[PDB]
Swiss-Prot record:
Impact reported for F103A: Strongly reduced affinity for histone H3. Significant decrease in interaction with KMT2A
WD repeats: 13-52, 55-96, 98-138, 139-178, 182-223, 226-266, 269-303
Effect of D77A: Strongly reduced affinity for histone H3. Significant decrease in interaction with KMT2A
Site (described: Important for interaction with histone H3): D77, F103, F233, E292
Protein name: WD repeat-containing protein 5
Reported impact of A17E: Strongly reduced affinity for histone H3
Effect on the protein upon substituting D77N: Strongly reduced affinity for histone H3
Amino acid sequence: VKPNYALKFTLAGHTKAVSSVKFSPNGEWLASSSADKLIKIWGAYDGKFEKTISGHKLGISDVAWSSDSNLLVSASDDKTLKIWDVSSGKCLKTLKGHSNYVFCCNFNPQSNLIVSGSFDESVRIWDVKTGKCLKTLPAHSDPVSAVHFNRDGSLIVSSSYDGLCRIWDTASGQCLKTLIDDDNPPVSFVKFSPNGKYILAATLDNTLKLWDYSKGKCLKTYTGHKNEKYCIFANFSVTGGKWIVSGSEDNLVYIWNLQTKEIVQKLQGHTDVVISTACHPTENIIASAALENDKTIKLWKSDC
Ligand SMILES: CN1CCN(c2ccc([N+](=O)[O-])cc2Nc2nccc3ccccc23)CC1
Ligand SMILES: O=C(O)c1c(O)c(NS(=O)(=O)c2cc(Br)ccc2O)cc(C2CC2)c1F
């Protein structure tokens, strides 16, 4: 019926705003990125600091894991993405091509491709092995806030301040669908649902929406949080009860019932905007991260 997330660890170390936290697919690690130009690795279960990964010349907006939990990609204000070997901390490739800040990144399930989105209004598809750009998609007419592959990597979804969500065919780069609302507020986050059927989209009018993309119909709306300024990540919680999880500009983590849309928990503790949340792949564990009045990551655990 309702979760009971309680605070287990506060992870200190970043010296500026923390922008993104991600659990490794095998559940072992949490990776964090920050405006301090650093990536940090932490134990997912004991919160123990593991290592700092350094090399970007400016701040980092996003990080993402390969499917074997061995590689990381990061997206930076220095206009590059970097591919990292987590075990060695070494930069394997620097992905060059974007003409402005890179805001978002993800591997496909095979992890032979990386997708990125940028202030430069493009979505790029990269070959992991060579580090070369395979395709540049003229995806949007304002900064791209999020990019995500579906279950098998055959589709990409992108979101933008231009107010649009777009679905792309990975192999051809052609646009398969454009989702439009009405009053087109900036779309600040998007991701495919666990079953690949739906898309979860945030707009900067304090609203999360679950869309059936093949029918182009909104199925659920989640409200009550604050989101009018920052691109705040959202998640599906798949380990216990079926929840939607998001940060909020009132410094709280919000948790909603997937089907009824009622708020079932609000997690208090952070002292700045909670810009990023992540849900552990097997354990009812949430990671949250906040902006520069806070600079910490928090790990929470629920019985359901
Ligand atoms: C995981 N997310 C984090 C937010 N990302 C993002 C998206 C659009 C814009 N944009 O359009 O400006 C900026 C950012 N980055 C940051 N936004 C706010 C505060 C930040 C603080 C430090 C580093 C990056 C920050 C996308 C991926
Ligand atoms: O009762 C359900 O199992 C169910 C459902 O599984 C999906 N699929 S999902 O991909 O959003 C999803 C979300 C989560 Br959290 C976990 C798994 C998952 O598969 C959607 C809906 C309603 C909202 C439309 C459901 F009621």
